[PDB]
Amino acid sequence: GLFGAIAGFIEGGWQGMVDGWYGYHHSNEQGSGYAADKESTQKAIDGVTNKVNSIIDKMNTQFEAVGREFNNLERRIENLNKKMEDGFLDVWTYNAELLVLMENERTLDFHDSNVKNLYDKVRLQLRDNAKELGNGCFEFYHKCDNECMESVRNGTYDYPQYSEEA
Amino acid sequence: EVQLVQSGAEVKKPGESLKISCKGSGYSFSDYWIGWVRQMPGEGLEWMGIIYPASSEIRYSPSFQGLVTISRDKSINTASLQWSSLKASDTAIYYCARHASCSARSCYWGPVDYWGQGTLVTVSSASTKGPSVFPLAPSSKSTSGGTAALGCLVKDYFPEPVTVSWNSGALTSGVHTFPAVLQSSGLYSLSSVVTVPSSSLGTQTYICNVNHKPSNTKVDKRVEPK
Amino acid sequence: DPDQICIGYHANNSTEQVDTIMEKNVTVTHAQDILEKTHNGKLCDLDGVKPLILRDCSVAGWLLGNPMCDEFINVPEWSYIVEKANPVNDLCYPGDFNDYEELKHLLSRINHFEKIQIIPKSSWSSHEASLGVSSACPYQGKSSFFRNVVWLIKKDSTYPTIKRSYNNTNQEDLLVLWGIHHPNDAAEQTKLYQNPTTYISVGTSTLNQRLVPRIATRSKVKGLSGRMEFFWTILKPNDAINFESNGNFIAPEYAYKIVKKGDSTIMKSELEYGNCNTKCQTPMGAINSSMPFHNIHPLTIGECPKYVKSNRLVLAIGLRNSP
Amino acid sequence: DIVMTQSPLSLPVSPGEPASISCRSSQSLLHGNGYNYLDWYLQKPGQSPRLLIYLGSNRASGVPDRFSGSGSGTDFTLKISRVEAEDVGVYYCMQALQTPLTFGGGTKVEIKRTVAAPSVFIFPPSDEQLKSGTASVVCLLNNFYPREAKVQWKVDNALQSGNSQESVTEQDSKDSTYSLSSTLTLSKADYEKHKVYACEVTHQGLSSPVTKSFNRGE
Ligand SMILES: *[C@@H]1O[C@H](CO)[C@@H](O[C@@H]2O[C@H](CO)[C@@H](O)[C@H](O)[C@H]2NC(C)=O)[C@H](O)[C@H]1NC(C)=O
Ligand SMILES: *[C@@H]1O[C@H](CO)[C@@H](O[C@@H]2O[C@H](CO)[C@@H](O)[C@H](O)[C@H]2NC(C)=O)[C@H](O)[C@H]1NC(C)=O
């Protein structure tokens, strides 16, 4: 949404990547393959799992509010019809449905942000040592083996080693 | 109106089982509590227990609980009382009686407004035996004598009861049939006496008519002077 | 060719859809349903405690002791109560019930009664308690009346003025029910009670009631234009209820001792007992679920989820699935 | 249980004068409604028990005005204004507050009359009985008042012990008297060794003990 990566630059997800939610696809002398970012995936799983508890908690806390407001109503008015209960049930159902729609918007936006953040993590390691093709891919000026890919995914990439050629 | 008809009379030996019953009529059998009352010979009334025949909830007495089984059956308006192994101490008369008609579990259990006729349950090691009847002769008086006394001795029978009449019911006045006594052998023995004018001894015939239904026995003994 | 590295996101064979602000039915890789929509469709126990199921009886019939409601003499403790929409056995004799909904609200607090006899039929010696029966309210095939109350009438062309009172010597609160007979006409009131203008006064420490039977040309309901009206009150321990009347008095025989007070409810349902046990129950059926929400029925009992009026509530966990 | 205690145990009453029976309870029988859950029952001789009073004071359908119950809580009483031959029997009070139901000890009530001595008779064993091997001698006290009496057997002026049984009739409807028999039981072997047989009777209406006797074989 705000930082749109899905419906942004890449034109689809990868079915070949089943290691995690986000990740990489390398291709070189040894051979190509998919692999997921262990750090961002693990953080995202622990981030969302609590988000579901807090959103369920949010929905419960104002079911009690809508209920408490009805309880105050019931004691005050002597002649209240059964149609009144439905009124408060609709009000809460409206808000229940609304709170799910809003949280689902953030969750898909949260992934779009994290995919965009992973892309920025990678480019700032490479800097001027790679081409930028403009479809979620980087092409190296230097030669990058499987051990060289390891250093990019993990976080400890060494720019000094590759001065255009190495 | 209300009627309680019982299913007596019974004679058994120690160890034998038994099931006496009582049929209610003239009301809703299932609506009224119905129960049992024991009366041992010569002693007072002992409440045994009641049962509500709609629910079959039984209110036993601690003295009788686990020793007799009270029952009820709506389909034929009958309440019953059972024994597993009888004893000599159970020899008594057992009264069936209607109680409250309260559907709750705490209430006025009375009035015990309608009672049965009782059923005689006799329990001993002796077996059914007919009576031996002997005459008690009238004579003899000093000089003439105004009133004379004669009778019959009904000896060695089991179980109760026996019915004694004189001249086939023609002679009721002045008669005394004594309650029976349980002899050391285990058989019963009573005596029946009647007082009459001494004038009649010469001409009037006197026969006592003893009937012991349990043994199908009928004895007519002629009682005459000398 | 040169070496390269690419950045992307997960995909799979998932077809789970979710709704958002801008889009409806967006296929995602993973999703969480938080709405329970199914039930076994049976009336069950609640933690092994069986409910009181009145079949074709109503609450009024049960407490007053309707002749057709013969199972519900001395019922055991219940978790909840079930009653059909239009129970055929309500008030056999055409009549009303004062504060009937208030009484039903009070039954939510109660889990178990114990019926006790307070005024035996035998005690009414100056009055004839045997008669006071009615057709269209049959017991054992015959004309009859409510079991827990007595329709008193005249005796030998006389209805002496009544003065009785019961003192609650129990430690528990006592539910007491009495009634008044609104006669058909002036000829009937003379026939039944021998007193043109009668009264019924009832008094406790809290309550003080004065009643008078009304005469009116009413419509024939079940072949009876004359009408009945029943009342009730809680008699707290050590407090006495004082009855006085000279006619039209439908006297109590039994009261109901409130022996357990907890959580209960009366639910409208046509369903029957299912020989099951559950932690959560609804009029439609039982719910065995670990969801936080459901959409079966607004009335529930036990440890349940909360009722929403929505058909669907799904949370998106994963990301957008392509293709 | 709730134990019930009646008094008196016996109650001889004259035809004209009244009677009164007390019945005490271990526990209060007064109910919250005001009524005492206590009944009274009459058992006429040879008949079943019948309802007399309930619940405390009200008369059962067929009960005359003479009978009336009274009292409250723990102590009660049954009053009778006049008593007649019809009213003889054992009167039982019973509580009906709690299960198990308990009856009282009972109050026997006979008709009181003037002292009347018994007519004493004695009977030797019949010849048909000796054939069997046993011999029973029967003494008879006919129509006397009061019930208390002494019948003592003496064979050849030797007091007999542990070989005779007594039996008393119920009180008479007409003359309110009692009759009593006594049977001395012996073997034929014993009976034919002694000659003189006599039952010596002693009773309030006699100035001295009356003795009726006979010699064996006339
Ligand atoms: C999203 O998909 C659901 C079904 O998965 C759609 O629900 C259908 O709605 C139509 C009419 O709107 C009904 O006739 C069908 O019965 C529904 N489907 C089912 C399986 O019951 C829903 O309409 C879709 N939403 C949008 C915005 O198109
Ligand atoms: C109901 O009965 C009680 C006693 O049976 C009456 O109040 C007192 O209760 C205590 C024990 O709870 C007794 O010891 C006293 O004897 C009672 N009376 C008095 C004057 O203290 C109570 O009055 C009765 N309720 C009524 C009449 O409404």
> Six-digit token pair at A147?
């051990």
The candidate with the shortest Cα–Cα distance to C35, out of C290, C284, C279, C283, is C290
Q: Please tell me whether the peptide bond between D12 and the residue prior to it is cis, using omega within 30 degrees of 0.
A: no
The candidate with the shortest Cα–Cα distance to C51, out of C290, C234, C283, C259, is C283
| Amino acid type, A11 | E
DSSP class of residue D112 equals P
Chain B residue whose CA is closest to D9? B44
By the 8 A CB rule, do C149 and C179 touch? yes
* β D164-168/A22-27 pair status: unpaired
D55 and C CB contact within 8 Å = yes
By the 8 A CB rule, do B116 and B23 touch? no
Q: Which residues of B touch C120 (CB under 8 A)?
A: 100, 102, 107-108
Resolution in A: 2.9
> Six-digit token pair at B124?
């001993």
**Which of B22, B36, B109 to mutate against chain D (most D CBs within 10 Å)?**
B109
Q: Which residue has the tokens 């129970």?
A: C87
> Cα angle vertex B189, ends B186, B193, to 5°?
170
| Measured distance CA(D70)–CA(C44) in Å, rounded | 55
Encode burial over D9-43: b for 16+ CB neighbours within 10 A, e otherwise: eebbbeeeeebebbbbbeeebbbbbbbbbbbbbbb
The candidate with the shortest Cα–Cα distance to D164, out of D147, D178, D151, is D151
For residue B114, what are the β-bridge partners?
A: B98
DSSP class of residue A31 equals -
Partner-chain contact B109 D1, CB within 8 Å? no
For residue D201, what are the β-bridge partners?
A: D151, D210
C-alpha distance from D36 to closest chain B C-alpha (Å): 10
By the 8 A CB rule, do B23 and B29 touch? no
| Chain D adjacent subunits, 3+ CB pairs under 8 A | B, C
Kind plus residue range of the DSSP H or E element containing D107: strand D107-109
| Amino acid type, C166 | Y
* CATH homologous superfamily of D1-112: Immunoglobulins (2.60.40.10)
| Measured distance CA(C241)–CA(C260) in Å, rounded | 22
| Measured distance CA(B99)–CA(B110) in Å, rounded | 5
Partner-chain contact D35 C123, CB within 8 Å? yes
- According to the 3-state scheme, what is the secondary structure of B119-155? EEEEECCCCCECCEEEEECCCCCCCCCCEEEEEEEEE
**From residue C307, how far is each of A72, A90, C302, C311 by CA, in Å?**
20, 11, 13, 11
| Measured distance CA(B119)–CA(B113) in Å, rounded | 19
Backbone angles phi, psi at A96, to 5 degrees: -65, -55
C-alpha of residue C112 to centroid of ligand 2, in Å: 27
> Six-digit token pair at C25?
């039915």
Q: At what angle do helices A146-154 and A83-126 cross, to 10 degrees?
A: 130
Q: Do chains C and B touch (3 or more CB pairs under 8 A)?
A: yes
Ligand nearest to the CA of C26: 1
Pocket test for ligand 2, best of C163, C166, C167 (most atoms within 8 A of CB): C167
Give the length of chain A.
166
Backbone angles phi, psi at C8, to 5 degrees: -155, -170
Our separate counts of H helices and E strands in chain B read 0, 19
Backbone angles phi, psi at B37, to 5 degrees: -135, 125
Q: Which residue has the tokens 């499987």?
A: A146
Q: What total number of domains does chain A contain? A: 1
Ligand nearest to the CA of C312: 1
Q: Which residue has the tokens 């790679």?
A: A130
> Six-digit token pair at B133?
């009847």
> Six-digit token pair at B207?
């026969």
Strands (E), B137-212: 147-157, 163-166, 175-177, 181-182, 188-197, 207-212
Q: What domain range includes position A20? A: 1-166
**From residue C123, how far is each of A37, B100, D75, D137 by CA, in Å?**
90, 12, 20, 58
| Measured distance CA(C201)–CA(C208) in Å, rounded | 8
Ligand 2 atom nearest C204 alpha carbon: 28
- Please give the full DSSP string across D170-201, using - where no structure is assigned: PPPTTT--EEEEEEEEEEHHHHTT--EEEEEE
Partner-chain contact D34 C118, CB within 8 Å? no
Pocket test for ligand 2, best of C235, C238, C242 (most atoms within 8 A of CB): C238
DSSP class of residue D60 equals P
Domain boundaries, chain D: 1-112, 113-218
| Measured distance CA(A125)–CA(A152) in Å, rounded | 7
The domain made up of C50-271 has a fold known as: Hemagglutinin (Ha1 Chain); Chain: A; domain 1 (3.90.209)
Given this chain, do its domains D1-112 and D113-218 carry the same CATH topology? yes
> Six-digit token pair at C267?
């639910």
> Six-digit token pair at B23?
């049929």
Partner-chain contact C115 B54, CB within 8 Å? no
- Please give the full DSSP string across D24-39, using - where no structure is assigned: EESS--B-TTS-B-EE
Q: Which residues of A touch C3 (CB under 8 A)?
A: 26-29, 139-140, 143-144
Q: Which residues of C touch A2 (CB under 8 A)?
A: none
User: What are the residue ranges of CATH 2.60.40.10 in chain B?
Assistant: 1-125, 126-226
Q: Do chains C and A touch (3 or more CB pairs under 8 A)?
A: yes
Radius of gyration of chain C, Cα coordinates, nearest whole angstrom:
29
| Measured distance CA(B87)–CA(B122) in Å, rounded | 10
| Amino acid type, B18 | L
* β C81-83/C240-245 pair status: unpaired
By the 8 A CB rule, do C304 and C290 touch? no
By the 8 A CB rule, do D88 and D107 touch? no
User: What are the residue ranges of CATH 3.90.209.20 in chain C?
Assistant: 50-271
C130 and B CB contact within 8 Å = no
| Measured distance CA(D183)–CA(B41) in Å, rounded | 21
Atom 26 of ligand 2, residue of closest alpha carbon: C240
By the 8 A CB rule, do C254 and B106 touch? no
By the 8 A CB rule, do B81 and B47 touch? no
Kind plus residue range of the DSSP H or E element containing C235: strand C227-235
| Measured distance CA(D196)–CA(D185) in Å, rounded | 15
By the 8 A CB rule, do D141 and D179 touch? yes
By the 8 A CB rule, do C302 and C39 touch? no
Ligand 1 atom nearest C24 alpha carbon: 27
C-alpha of residue C238 to centroid of ligand 2, in Å: 7
Ligand nearest to the CA of C16: 1
CA D216 to chain centre: 35
User: What are the residue ranges of CATH 2.10.77.10 in chain C?
Assistant: 1-49+272-323
Atom 28 of ligand 2, residue of closest alpha carbon: C240
Backbone angles phi, psi at A38, to 5 degrees: -70, -30
Q: Which residues of B touch C122 (CB under 8 A)?
A: 108, 110-111
Ligand 2 atom nearest C238 alpha carbon: 1
Backbone angles phi, psi at C144, to 5 degrees: -155, 180
Domain B1-125 has CATH 3.90.1200.10: no
C-alpha distance from D110 to closest chain B C-alpha (Å): 16
By the 8 A CB rule, do C128 and C154 touch? yes
Atom 14 of ligand 2, residue of closest alpha carbon: C238
- Starting at the edge strand found earlier in the chain, the sheet holding B163-166 runs B163-166, B207-212, B217-222
Partner-chain contact D123 B137, CB within 8 Å? yes
**CATH code, A146:** 3.90.20.10
By the 8 A CB rule, do D32 and C164 touch? no
Pocket test for ligand 1, best of C25, C33, C312 (most atoms within 8 A of CB): C25
By the 8 A CB rule, do C23 and C37 touch? no
In CATH, the architecture of C1-49+272-323 is Ribbon (2.10)
- Starting at the edge strand found earlier in the chain, the sheet holding D75-80 runs D4-7, D19-25, D75-80, D67-72
By the 8 A CB rule, do C178 and C148 touch? no
> Six-digit token pair at B173?
């006045």
| Amino acid type, C254 | Y
Domain D113-218 has CATH 3.40.190.10: no
| Measured distance CA(C86)–CA(A144) in Å, rounded | 82
Backbone angles phi, psi at B100, to 5 degrees: -80, -60
| Measured distance CA(D47)–CA(C57) in Å, rounded | 47
| Measured distance CA(C144)–CA(C134) in Å, rounded | 5
Chain D residue whose CA is closest to C125? D58
> Six-digit token pair at A32?
């190509």
A154 and C CB contact within 8 Å = no
Q: Which residues of B touch D43 (CB under 8 A)?
A: 45
The candidate with the shortest Cα–Cα distance to B116, out of D63, A67, C200, D50, is D50
Q: Which residues of D touch C125 (CB under 8 A)?
A: 58
| Amino acid type, C292 | P
B138 and D CB contact within 8 Å = no
Ligand 1 atom nearest C25 alpha carbon: 1
Q: List all residues whose CB is within 6 A of at least one atom of ligand 2.
A: C 167, 238-240
- Starting at the edge strand found earlier in the chain, the sheet holding A33-36 runs A33-36, A22-27, C4-9, A137-140, A130-132
**Neighbouring C-alpha atoms within 13 Å toward the C-beta of A126:** 26
The domain made up of B126-226 has a fold known as: Immunoglobulin-like (2.60.40)
By the 8 A CB rule, do B78 and B23 touch? yes
